[PDB]
Amino acid sequence: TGNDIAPSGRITGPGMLATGLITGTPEFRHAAREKPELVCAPRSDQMDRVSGEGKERCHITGDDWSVNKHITGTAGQWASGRNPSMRGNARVVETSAFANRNVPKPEKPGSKITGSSGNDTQGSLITYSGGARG
Amino acid sequence: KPELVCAPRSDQMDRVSGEGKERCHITGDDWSVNKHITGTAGQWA
Amino acid sequence: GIALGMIETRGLVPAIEAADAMTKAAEVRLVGRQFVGGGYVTVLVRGETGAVNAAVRAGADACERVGDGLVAAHIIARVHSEVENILPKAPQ
Amino acid sequence: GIALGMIETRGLVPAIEAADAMTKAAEVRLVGRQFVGGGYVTVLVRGETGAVNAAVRAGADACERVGDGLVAAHIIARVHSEVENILPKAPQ
Amino acid sequence: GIALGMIETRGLVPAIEAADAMTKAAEVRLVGRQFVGGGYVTVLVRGETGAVNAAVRAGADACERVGDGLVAAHIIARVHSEVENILPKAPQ
Amino acid sequence: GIALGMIETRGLVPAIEAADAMTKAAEVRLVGRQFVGGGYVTVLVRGETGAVNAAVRAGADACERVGDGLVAAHIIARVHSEVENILPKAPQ
Amino acid sequence: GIALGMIETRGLVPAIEAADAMTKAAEVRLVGRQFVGGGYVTVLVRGETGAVNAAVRAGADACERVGDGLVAAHIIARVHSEVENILPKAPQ
Amino acid sequence: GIALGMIETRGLVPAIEAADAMTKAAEVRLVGRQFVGGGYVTVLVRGETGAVNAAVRAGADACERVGDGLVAAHIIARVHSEVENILPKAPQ
Amino acid sequence: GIALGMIETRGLVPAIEAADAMTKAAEVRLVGRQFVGGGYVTVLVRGETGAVNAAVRAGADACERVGDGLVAAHIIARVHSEVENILPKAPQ
Amino acid sequence: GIALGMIETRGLVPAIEAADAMTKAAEVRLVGRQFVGGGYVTVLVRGETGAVNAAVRAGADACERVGDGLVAAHIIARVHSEVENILPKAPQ
Amino acid sequence: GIALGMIETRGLVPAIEAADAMTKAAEVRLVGRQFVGGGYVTVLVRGETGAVNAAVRAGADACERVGDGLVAAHIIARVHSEVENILPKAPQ
Amino acid sequence: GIALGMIETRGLVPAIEAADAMTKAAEVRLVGRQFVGGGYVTVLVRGETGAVNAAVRAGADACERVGDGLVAAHIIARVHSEVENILPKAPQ
Amino acid sequence: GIALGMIETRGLVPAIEAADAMTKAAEVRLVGRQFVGGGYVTVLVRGETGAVNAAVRAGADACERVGDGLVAAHIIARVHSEVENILPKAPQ
Amino acid sequence: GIALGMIETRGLVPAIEAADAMTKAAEVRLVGRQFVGGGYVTVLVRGETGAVNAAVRAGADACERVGDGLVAAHIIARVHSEVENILPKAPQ
């Protein structure tokens, strides 16, 4: 109670702008409270957990450092669960050269130039000052 | 968001052809005037 | 200023109407009126880049329903030195 | 500058908001506040055509829903020499 | 502070009640009262943005039912230098 | 003041627009801008809680539809002393 | 001048092409080319409100079709003094 | 700061939780913790209107369910000078 | 340590039982007992966050069924500096 | 150089736009602007083959959409001495 | 302290919120703020195991709804003595 | 004069292939490779307009299918004086 | 040992988890932590071929579900003398 | 050897495996690993065309499946003198 200063629609001013896009406001802090054919398995079909000099695609018989299921030890539960963790929900938006390989782009420039031009429409899009096709 | 900042070339043709162009949407304090601002152009010219 | 505002029309009546609307509308000066030939008549003004934009828009609106109408409205905010050789220096 | 931009509103509060928006948006000079009478309050700004165009547009948006309302937003890129007498030069 | 709080009303009785509630409500400094004409009366206060928000809310809901009523209640967190000429610094 | 207002945007064009809107809107001081990396720009302003609220809302509104757009708009009314080690001290 | 014009592009080739178009289109001063990171490259020009409005328009049109394209084209007619602490003065 | 923010709780433990939440949320200075008697513990903070609003809101939420809980959360933007005689100046 | 663990009970008998259990359970030092009034007695301990966690849990368990019963058990890992004014430094 | 770049347009407005773009986009010399009758205007520039090639590309793009449009855009890498007689030596 | 608390976010605004929350909640010393690149910003805190558990829990919950949000929150009660060579000792 | 030709690619390997092809095709001086950020790489060459035209055309063909790909290929026959300040003078 | 074991991850938090797990899993010394850019972080260890295999497998499982996740896991039994130059010798 | 062989991968781990395969496959010297940005990493080896051709063929195969993968594998039998400025000379 008391001298409320919460944003309201009756009182115009800056306080009413950007409703819903703002966080950390007293209003939002409160809301949060609430025999296989081949020795080595197919290269394409299988992906190895550790790729180099630790690959299990090739069936190396005899003595080897592979540990079966009945043998407990260092890996698995004994390494995964040592430290508590929390996986959050984030907006993973990739802004990079590869991500922009397919972007909505304007119409390709066209050259109506004639004469001693030496132009080639086949070649990759060369551009000239102004964006004119070169 | 708009897919392209400037409207497609052959889709439209600007009233004033160069440097008075309107195809490219430019946010900020540009010199565009909407219906609310009467004035220099229109029936007044 | 240096910006150039060009309005092109078919015939002379629309051009004179456009030169009158352009100069009255904004702070610009009528550098010239060239008879292109085949009907087209071009009126050129000079002024601040913002003033020229206002004048040409007013000029285009004025002369688009006078005679055979408007052909081309243009603004060039900075005109290269070479082009100034082919522009009317001052009205005849 | 020479370009003139006017925003007329019903009451003073819309006009003060319009003036703040106009003088914040672009380089314009608040030349006058005129109590027309009957609730009409006019704010006049002067500057370059581009600056005034942005200033008046920003002012119209700001005071559209503020108080009684906006009456008119008007831009004149170049006022006649005669009209310069009726226009205010600097505010009271 | 520099923020500005405005309340516009139809008459002088609502304006004084709004001015009384505004000053009592929060740490605001009543600066001006304006007779806009046509019944509009404006009361302007200055202070910190938080203080102004409290005062205008108190003034708006205190002067709403007295007299013809409340026309405009508005806040400006920062006021441009040009507008300071059109606002009344002295208490009356 | 000590309240911290933060706006995170994609690209610099939205961020500079937010900085202009934020500083213009309320009585806050720009303490710096940081290129987070991967097309993230964070603009920070420090001031009183009332001003920072008004500033951030103005910045969020201004830059919402500019360039790629707005990512975040946060207000920490009091930042622990430790966080001041990572916050920028003055703009560069 | 004081007005600021800004263009944001994906990559540097459209950024340089935009910068050339802006400076060739109108009498503006290129004050910075900033690598925002993540691809975005921002070119900033400063001049008169009319000149910058023309310069940015030419920059956007030329840069649109070059490379990945154009992200933003923005004018700020008046730049608040606090926001100039985060704006390059001479290009790097 | 002149605004007053008070939280009243049934039992001391919620009061200390309220004081902790209030003093962490915003820039509010704790002025006193009064044992009213009958199991009521009132914590008073003095700060700017924005800080007081933010702190009290945080205080009420934090101690809403801690122990017996909350009795009252009140914000006064300005207390009459006579009331300040019955308010703690420094905590005890 | 800085973490604060406090138990509030109805009557002194549960408070003494809680005080005994708290000190027996973990490495936490008793810092005070407050007679809140209305038959509320609050015992506070200070220690490391883990130690205080164990102490409060053991304290609440011991005094839950003792006498009138238990009102509140609360842990604050870090207590703001201002709140340190109202906490007892050492028991009386 | 001796390379001749020629752009023919319907009306003077596209011709001046073509000439402006051509001389701004390369190191060419504007030698003539010849009215042909029928509304055709032709702007002729001379320079090195590389410069003329870039200019005519820039000119054709700039004036394609301006006014009535473009008629021709041709490049002659080396001009026979006989043709030099019919070409204009200096702009008029 | 020896326990390490790390929170990773997809911006800097969620990182600053997370740091504020962690530092306020428990007794943790902020040791680093790293721009991993690609947008990710990681905040590392050091303290006793009990304090770190509360700090990370507070930080993880605070920044979840701010900006792009939380990528990871991790607690390593003791880090191998080799890992301490790649950890910051104090933010720059 | 001296022209500018630039090839923007995704990754360094395409850029070096463009830099190799461009310099082998004509007498163009490689002035700089820029890591724009986000995976864009730009290579810039200076030389006569004809030399730059042949170089860029050869570079665009060579690096089209190499690696992630080609983003942009640009040739600027005349580079404004202002834009020179943002271009590398020589490679490092 | 000279065998090299590398784990790559998205973000710093998964990388540190993997490094701690690898150092704790077997007899491997942590040599480097690299920010590859774009969110990738790589952690490198040296040691016996058998030990490195055990460590990397533990680290791969440890950081698989931490943060964005595991990118790559690699073991090189013998590193060519040339490659030793581009590998970190010890962590900064 | 003049010939240059470059492999581009997404992440450092594939690059390191590519470097080892390339150096072990033939007689090539690793001149440097570069972090292009956005996750791109490039390893450049130099040697005789025969050694470079065999090494890059082995390198692309070895790292094709490691981590995110391979982006580019290129062979330049002769590198121009100008391009040698932008290439690494010795690894760091």
Author numbering:
A (entry chain A6): 703 to 736, 770 to 869
B (entry chain A5): 770 to 814
C (entry chain Y), D (entry chain e), E (entry chain j), F (entry chain 7), G (entry chain 5), H (entry chain A1), ...: 6 to 97
What did the published study say regarding this structure?
Among diverse BMCs, carboxysomes are specific CO2-fixing BMCs found in all cyanobacteria and many proteobacteria. The carboxysome uses a polyhedral protein shell to encapsulate the key CO2 fixation enzymes, ribulose-1,5-bisphosphate carboxylase/oxygenase (Rubisco) and carbonic anhydrase (CA). Carboxysome shells are typically composed of three groups of structural components that form hexamers, pentamers, and trimers.
The cryo-EM structures of T = 9, T = 9 Q = 12, T = 13, T = 16, and T = 19 shell assemblies were determined at 2.3-, 2.99-, 2.93-, 2.75-, and 3.04-Å resolution, respectively. T represents the area of a triangular facet within an icosahedral shell, whereas Q denotes the area of an elongated face within a prolate shell. Consistent with the T = 9 mini-shell, all the shell assemblies produced from the midi-shell construct exhibit additional densities at the shell inner surfaces. The structural conservation of pentamer-hexamer interfaces and the variety of hexamer-hexamer interfaces indicate that the change in the shell size is more likely driven by the variations in hexamer-hexamer interactions than at pentamer-hexamer interfaces (see detailed discussions below).
